[PDB]
Amino acid sequence: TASISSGPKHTQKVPILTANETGATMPVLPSDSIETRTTYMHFNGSETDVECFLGR
Amino acid sequence: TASISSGPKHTQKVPILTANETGATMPVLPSDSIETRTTYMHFNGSETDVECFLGRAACVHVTEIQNKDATGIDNHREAKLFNDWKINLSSLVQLRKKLELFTYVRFDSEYTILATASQPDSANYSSNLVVQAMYVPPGAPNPKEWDDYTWQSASNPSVFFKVGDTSRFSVPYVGLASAYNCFYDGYSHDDAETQYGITVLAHMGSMAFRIVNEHDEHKTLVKIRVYHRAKHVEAWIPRAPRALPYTSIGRTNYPKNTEPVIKKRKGDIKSY
Amino acid sequence: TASISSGPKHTQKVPILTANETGATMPVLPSDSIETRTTYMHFNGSETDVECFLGRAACVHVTEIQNKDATGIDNHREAKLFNDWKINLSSLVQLRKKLELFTYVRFDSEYTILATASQPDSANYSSNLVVQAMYVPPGAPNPKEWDDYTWQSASNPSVFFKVGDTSRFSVPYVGLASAYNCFYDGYSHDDAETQYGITVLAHMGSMAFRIVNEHDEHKTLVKIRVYHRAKHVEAWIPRAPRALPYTSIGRTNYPKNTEPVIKKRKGDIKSY
Amino acid sequence: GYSDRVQQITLGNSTITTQEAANAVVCYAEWPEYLPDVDASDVNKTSKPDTSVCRFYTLDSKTWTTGSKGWCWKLPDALKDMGVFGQNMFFHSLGRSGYTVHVQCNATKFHSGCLLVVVIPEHQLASHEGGNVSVKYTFTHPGERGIDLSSANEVGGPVKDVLYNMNGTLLGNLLIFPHQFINLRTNNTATIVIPYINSVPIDSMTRHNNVSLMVIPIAPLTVPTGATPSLPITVTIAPMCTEFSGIRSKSIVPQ
Amino acid sequence: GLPTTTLPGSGQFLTTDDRQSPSALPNYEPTPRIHIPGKVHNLLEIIQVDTLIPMNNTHTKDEVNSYLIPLNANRQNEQVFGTNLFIGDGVFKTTLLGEIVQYYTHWSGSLRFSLMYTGPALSSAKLILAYTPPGARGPQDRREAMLGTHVVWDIGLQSTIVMTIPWTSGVQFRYTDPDTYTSAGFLSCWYQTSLILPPETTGQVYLLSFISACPDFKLRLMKDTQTISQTVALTE
Amino acid sequence: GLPTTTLPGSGQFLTTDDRQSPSALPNYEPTPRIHIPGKVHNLLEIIQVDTLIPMNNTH
Amino acid sequence: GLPTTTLPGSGQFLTTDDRQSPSALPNYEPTPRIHIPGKVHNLLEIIQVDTLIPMNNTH
Amino acid sequence: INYYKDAASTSSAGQSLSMDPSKFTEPVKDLMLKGAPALN
Amino acid sequence: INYYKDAASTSSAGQSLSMDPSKFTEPVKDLMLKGAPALN
Amino acid sequence: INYYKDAASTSSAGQSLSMDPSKFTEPVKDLMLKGAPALN
């Protein structure tokens, strides 16, 4: 599976401008606004499962 | 698989002359310089594997708590009504010298906790106490009294066992980086007075102990011994073994006016 | 599979006349000299196998340690605050005579350690003590006090069990040679005064015992009994059984003015 | 006619030639390489100035005399002020680098003396005070000057006792670390290639030094009769495969 | 309900046993491993790297000088140094080899002893190193020494000489803590001809000496080292 | 009778262990589940919804 | 957790029982065996060698 | 292996590995594409 | 048989049986052959 | 079933069922046949 590689941008397509009045949290990522390099997650989110959270 | 047979030599090819200035240790064998006969190894080097070397339980900590009437005690922590321990492997030196043969080390821990009771002054009997050991990760509320809401430990792993018995559980490698640093030549930030060497890179959690029992008429001393066994060991970059005595958890410092560590000859260089 | 049927004989072939000077024991049977009938063995000789003969636990050592206030004790070892034992199989004679039927012996050991407590003088109660038995191989630091750094035992196998209980573990054959010498007609070097007979060839390690508990108001005597069972036995070269009493661990010496070991007849050679 | 003996290292816009080498050591048998994605964590694209930072900087020279105890430099500290390497260093949040270290000391066939040149990963120093006294920042960041083991104890500084490596271990066992000797009779330089060694993929270049280079006289310098009793030792070091990441405002560090 | 019987040893804690345990942190995900040069797998890997021996032990406080074996110009027939081979004690004891051997009870195998010469390049020398196998005394003169394992070393361009102490033994293991029955011999070194310095040169020259184990080597039965102890627990 | 040995840790209660237990109510039948909008499975699902920060903390 | 019941005899030590035990020295390698003439396997092997009888016991 | 008959007696459940924040993060009636204008 | 779910809870690891001293004993850049001259 | 890893930890060995007294009862160099004269 955490960040893809992304480079300079000069577009008409701006993912960082939104309207929060709508009630959504738009899924913006580091790569929408800076230049990133690939990295992997190495993680599953196992210990935040509700079974785990309420299970001790 | 130890020595091959080898006979007289009169060559232009001399394996025993080398240049140590290069930094290599050339792999010279008995058969390069005497006449040998075949012999087999009969041995694998099993018990020198690092998993084996670091894999037996070592005592890492001895603490003590007491069961007594807390009535009128203004500071439970101070009366040893309960006690914490920030986990370390560098306070008792036996295991410490072993680990510091390496620079970075990675392993799961298996803890065994033995608890025995003492009744140094007149008691009718020996009571049966249950100890509670709570694992308190950094950021959790810390116990203030021996019976705080903290001990509810609703999200924090805790084990309850009886004094005289042993408790045993195993914790995965909790380091923040890829390995634990046995050494760190750095600071936590570029501060002019921040501490040197001691780092979170080594941090393994922390543990709080208490007796669950209320008090009987006599007082009971319970002494806790924590044992630690590394399992699934991985070690990188060997270093020179520790020669001088240790003075502090986490610094390399040795004591002043220490004694010569190399044994002086009783005789000459020429002596046997 | 014990006797075949055999009838009258009038031969030139006499199996019962031999020459013992040769050193052989000729395999003569009932059927060589009387008339027999067939009978079967019905038996295998199972319980005379050397694995069986040396394979049951035998008491090899009884020692004793006490739990008491060490305050002001200048010599813990001397107060039986703790105690060592250099492992042996020749101090209690029952098992010793059995092993010395052979010259070289090779086996794994299974140890059982029973610990019971005694309170010879007025106590309110019986405390519950945990014993620690440390295996101290030659070259390890030896305990000096009952709570030295030694007891950390970070590299040395140690077992913790409760008084009244038993501890059990098994140690591989730790001999330096291919077998343990039950006997050794040699010295450690050609010295004019070095000891004769006693050898490292027999060395099996050594063991140190202590109570982990601090002291209660009374004193408690704990007496340790070590049992040893040979498993995976291999024995070479049978010898004459021991006739006279033993005097020392590791020497063959018998006591002076000992008594006749052969029972004198009450009567003649002719007596029944 | 290639000898182990003559060598040329060209890195960037700078070249070194030695006509009296004794092979070269590559720490742990690994050559410096950039940070692979599979090992990456920070999502930032990194900056690789290449030839402007990966060239040879020659630190100021030392003087070996019969009384010398040895010198110690820390990396990347020693280079904190060299050209654009240094700027990059103070300006990014994180950086990573390997190095080629070339230590030089020539004499004549009448001199004797032998230096140990060793690289120690994570050399945490000891306070000469004992106990749990710390070693202040400035003291472990001597810069190009390095630490002079024959200088006096100072307050908040490290211990400078050579038989103990500045940490409670014996000089004799430093040989377990990548190292090379300079024996006037054999050798005139020592070269060690250092791959990046850390427990994290990239780190801060200012709060943590990841190797100390140490040059220690072991067989004392002995000059021919009526020779001047000393020789200079020069250290030239080149960052290799350097990467910087997390650019911003420019760190301010004590002193 | 399945019927069981518990055996002797139940409830004991043996620091050397290896079993499963519940994880206190169910479901936790450890940090990924990244690559780090230098991984060690066996202590046998590292005792083959040679380290310096403080052979010149004759000082009174630890000094860089006890690593230096001195050589005198123009002496003939004489002896350069001597030592027994109790690798767990004496000169050997602080070396990495000595230091690891001390974590085990028994050792077997060949040792590699080398000497690197540091004298001016225009000097010359011929030394003899001799290994004396157990059973005889430390040699008292070269004649005595030369009848056992030996190497005539000719000091040249090639600066180091590697002598091997081949495993000579009845019993297949020796004790690391010095023991008689189990003893390994002596190592001595003498002038074969003599050190000669060039003109304009003077004084003593020194040899550095190293020790490491051959690939031959075996160590077994781990135990605690006499090389480290303590009187109270340390704190931060 | 099968021979056993008990290990260190026997009888301990670790609040984080996960094992089977006898049911006190053998054979009881729980109420059927009906559908309810909004099921959460991971705390990671919810920390992606944004909420307001009291940035102006100065009161 | 599997349900068990312990029988009479639990915890006893019978010097003649034969069971497994943990090794105190995990991973240790014993010295190789070499050949030695004379191996004995059964006491029945040796009681077939004849030995002298002190028949004249009258001393 | 379950040793017991009832389902309540089994150990903890196993990770949903479900994970779909959109019911919480994007419950809008007309779909919003990142990059397209929020309000047209 | 593992009785437990997590990997940390398993017993000790099993012998590397890796063993390669050359990173420590021969980290030289140009390969040295035993028997050939050290310095050419 | 061995529950333990090391060989020393296994139970007792099992009967040699070897049994050959001739090394002890007839170690003579020239073979003696029962019934034939001992000394020829």
> CB-based contacts of E140: which residues, under 8 Å, 6+ apart?
none
| Interchain CB distance below 8 Å, J21 and G49 | yes
Q: What is the CATH number of the domain that holds D202?
A: 2.60.120.20
The answer to whether the beta carbons of residues E22 and F17 sit under 8 Å apart is yes
* Experimental approach: X-ray
Cα–Cα dist E174/E105, whole Å: 9
**Number of B–F residue contacts, CB under 8 Å:** 36
| Interchain CB distance below 8 Å, A37 and D37 | yes
Q: What is the length of chain C? A: 272
C to J contact (≥3 Cβ pairs closer than 8 Å): yes
Domain locations in chain E?
1-236
Partner B contacted by G29 (CB < 8 A) = yes
For every residue of chain C, which 3-state class applies, written as one string?
CCECCCCCCCCCCCCCCCCHHHCCCCCCCHHHCCCCCCECCCCCCHHHEHHHHHCCCEEEEEEEEEECCCCCCCCCCCCCCEEEEECCCCCCHHHHHHHCCEEEEEEEEEEEEEEEEECCCCCCCCCCCEEEEEECCECECCCCCCCCHHHHCCCCCEEEEEECEEEEEEECCCCCCCCEECCCCCCCCCCCCCCCCCCHHHCCCEEEEEECCCCCCCCEEEEEEEEEEEEEEEEEEECCCCCCCCCCCCCCCCCCCCCCCCCCCCCCCCCC
Phi-psi category of residue E27: left, alpha or beta, with phi > 0 → left and psi -120 to 50 → alpha: left
Which of B93, I32, G51 lies closest to D168 in space, CA to CA? B93
- Kindly tell me the sign of the dihedral angle through the C-alpha atoms of E168, E172, E178, E183: negative
Domain locations in chain B?
1-272
| Interchain CB distance below 8 Å, F21 and G4 | no
Contacts of residues E138-147 at CB distance under 8 Å and 24 or more positions apart, as own/partner, are E138/B272, E138/E82, E138/E84, E138/E186, E138/E188, E139/E186, E139/E188, E141/E77, E141/E79, E141/E190, E142/E77, E142/E79, E142/E190, E142/E191, E142/E192, E145/E188, E145/E190
Cα–Cα dist C249/D147, whole Å: 62
Task: Write the single-letter amino acid at D123.
Answer: H
CATH annotation of E1-236: 2.60.120.20
The answer to whether the beta carbons of residues C227 and C111 sit under 8 Å apart is yes
Closest approach of J27 to chain G, Cα-based (Å): 11
Q: What is the number of other CB atoms lying within 10 angstroms of the CB of residue I5? A: 14
Cα–Cα dist C67/H40, whole Å: 86
Closest approach of B235 to chain F, Cα-based (Å): 28
Burial of B149: CB neighbours in 10 Å, binned 0-12, 13-18, 19+: exposed
Question: In total, how many domains does chain D have?
Answer: 1
Residues D33-51, buried b or exposed e (16+ Cβ, 10 A)? eebeeebbbbbbbbbebee
Nearest-by-CA chain G residue for H10? G1
With vertex at residue D129, the alpha carbon angle to CA D128 and CA D132, rounded to the nearest 5 degrees, is: 110
Partner C contacted by E93 (CB < 8 A) = no
Identify the CATH class of B1-272.
mainly beta
Cα–Cα dist C198/J19, whole Å: 32
For every residue of C159-171, which 3-state class applies, written as one string?
EEEEECEEEEEEE
| Interchain CB distance below 8 Å, F14 and B112 | no
Residue F29 CA neighbour count, 13 Å, CB half:
1
Q: How far lies D110's CA from each of C250, D11, D176, E153, I38, in Å?
A: 64, 34, 31, 21, 22
- Say whether G6 sits in a helix, a strand or coil: strand
Task: Write the single-letter amino acid at F53.
Answer: I
Task: Write the single-letter amino acid at D200.
Answer: V
* Per-position DSSP letters for I4-28, written without gaps between them: SSSGGGS----------THHHH--B
The answer to whether the beta carbons of residues B54 and B101 sit under 8 Å apart is no
All structural domains of chain I: 1-40 (4.10.80.10)
Cα–Cα dist C47/D42, whole Å: 72
- Kindly tell me the sign of the dihedral angle through the C-alpha atoms of J33, J34, J38, J40: negative
Contact residues, chain F, for A50 at CB < 8 Å:
40-43
- Say whether G18 sits in a helix, a strand or coil: coil
| Interchain CB distance below 8 Å, G19 and F4 | no
Phi-psi category of residue B164: left, alpha or beta, with phi > 0 → left and psi -120 to 50 → alpha: left
| Interchain CB distance below 8 Å, J8 and C232 | yes
Nearest-by-CA chain B residue for A48? B155
- Identify the domain containing residue D123 by its residue range: 1-255
Task: List the single residue in C53, C236, C263 with the smallest CB-CB distance to G43.
Answer: C53
Which of D240, D76, D102 lies closest to D180 in space, CA to CA? D102
- Say whether D112 sits in a helix, a strand or coil: strand
Residues J4-29, buried b or exposed e (16+ Cβ, 10 A)? bebebbbbbbebbeeeebeebbbeee
> CB-based contacts of B53: which residues, under 8 Å, 6+ apart?
B98, E43, E103, E222
Task: List the single residue in D175, D197, D224 with the smallest CB-CB distance to E51.
Answer: D175
